[PDB]
Amino acid sequence: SDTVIERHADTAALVAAAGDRLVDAISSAIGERGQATIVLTGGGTGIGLLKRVRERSGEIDWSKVHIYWGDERFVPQDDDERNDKQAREALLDHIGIPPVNVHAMAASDGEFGDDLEAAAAGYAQLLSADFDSSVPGFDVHLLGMGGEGHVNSLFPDTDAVRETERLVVGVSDSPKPPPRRITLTLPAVQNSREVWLVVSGEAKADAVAAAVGGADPVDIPAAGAVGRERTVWLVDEAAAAKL
Ligand SMILES: [Cl-]
Ligand SMILES: [Cl-]
Ligand SMILES: [Cu+2]
Ligand SMILES: [Cu+2]
Ligand SMILES: [Cu+2]
Ligand SMILES: [Cu+2]
Ligand SMILES: [Cu+2]
Ligand SMILES: [Cu+2]
Ligand SMILES: [Cu+2]
Ligand SMILES: [Cu+2]
Ligand SMILES: [Cu+2]
Ligand SMILES: [Cu+2]
Ligand SMILES: [Cu+2]
Ligand SMILES: [Cu+2]
Ligand SMILES: [Cu+2]
Ligand SMILES: [Cu+2]
Ligand SMILES: [Cu+]
């Protein structure tokens, strides 16, 4: 699998570039296969790039695009900490995507109640359904990365990042609030044609260098975030400073 690193000046430049790249990737996938399956992420740059996509959203036939999430905060549906809510405000509420093409992870006041394990297994069955229909399962899985290398809600040195069988798990004790999350696991992330890590800032530079260096994914979860066709690091100068 090829690896691409593309370094831009600063956060604003990075987010603009990443949004442009995503519009191009979605168009390319629709051209080749008649549809596109994309996995969204949260965090500042993950949501910021979606705002840029919104600027060019007329270039895409959204009836042909399917949306998943790599992780989600297991909190009430209307909570500001929700990744799906933030994505809807940034992009999804502004485009002609059919609601049934959008596959949000469950909320804690949703159909599974506050049962985290059931909610994770619910999304896993949905991915099994996607994975029964397409190979690889995803065209592009977007990711942010924390300073310690975490991606989705897979934190270093945890049973979640160690998971090799299940596609989705619950995390009940995230070291970063909120404590409860639903997350795709590395086997699910790795069933993407491309995995894109969008990373800004000095505090991320050590983890970028360790992940690109080919670290063990348990120690640096981002090192296991690898696409079947390519892995793309979209970074700014500050985050690239140890390459
Ligand atoms: Cl609000
Ligand atoms: Cl339980
Ligand atoms: Cu640039
Ligand atoms: Cu600037
Ligand atoms: Cu472009
Ligand atoms: Cu409420
Ligand atoms: Cu809140
Ligand atoms: Cu809040
Ligand atoms: Cu708002
Ligand atoms: Cu709008
Ligand atoms: Cu359901
Ligand atoms: Cu349970
Ligand atoms: Cu995270
Ligand atoms: Cu254990
Ligand atoms: Cu350092
Ligand atoms: Cu410079
Ligand atoms: Cu869908």
Classify 38 as helix, strand or coil: strand
How far is ligand 6, taken at its centre, from the CA of residue 216, in Å? 41
Length of the chain in terms of residues written: 243
Whether the Cβ atoms of residue 174 and residue 182 lie closer than 8 Å to each other: no
Within 13 Å of residue 148, how many CA atoms lie on the same side as its CB? 13
Ligand in nearest proximity to the CA of 121? 12
Experimental approach: X-ray
**Known binder of ligand: residue 78?**
yes
Domains in the chain, CATH or no CATH each: 1-243 (3.40.50.1360)
Has 141 been labeled as part of a binding site? no
Ion ligand 10 — residues with CB under 5 Å? 94
Closest to 165 (Cα-Cα) out of 182, 179, 186: 186
Q: 45-60 in b/e burial notation, b at 16+ Cβ within 10 A?
A: bbbbbbebbbeebeeb
**CB 207 within 8 Å of CB 146:** yes
Q: Is 115 annotated as a binding residue?
A: yes
What's the DSSP call for residue 15? H
Query: Between β-strands 71-73 and 181-184, what pairing exists: parallel, antiparallel or unpaired?
Result: antiparallel
Question: Nearest ligand, CA of residue 28?
Answer: 5
Is 132 labelled a binding residue? Answer: no
- Ligand 8 centroid to residue 189 C-alpha, Å: 27
Identify the CA nearest to 68 among candidates 87, 51, 81: 87
Which amino acid belongs to residue 179?
P
Q: Which ligand has the shortest distance to the CA of 8?
A: 3
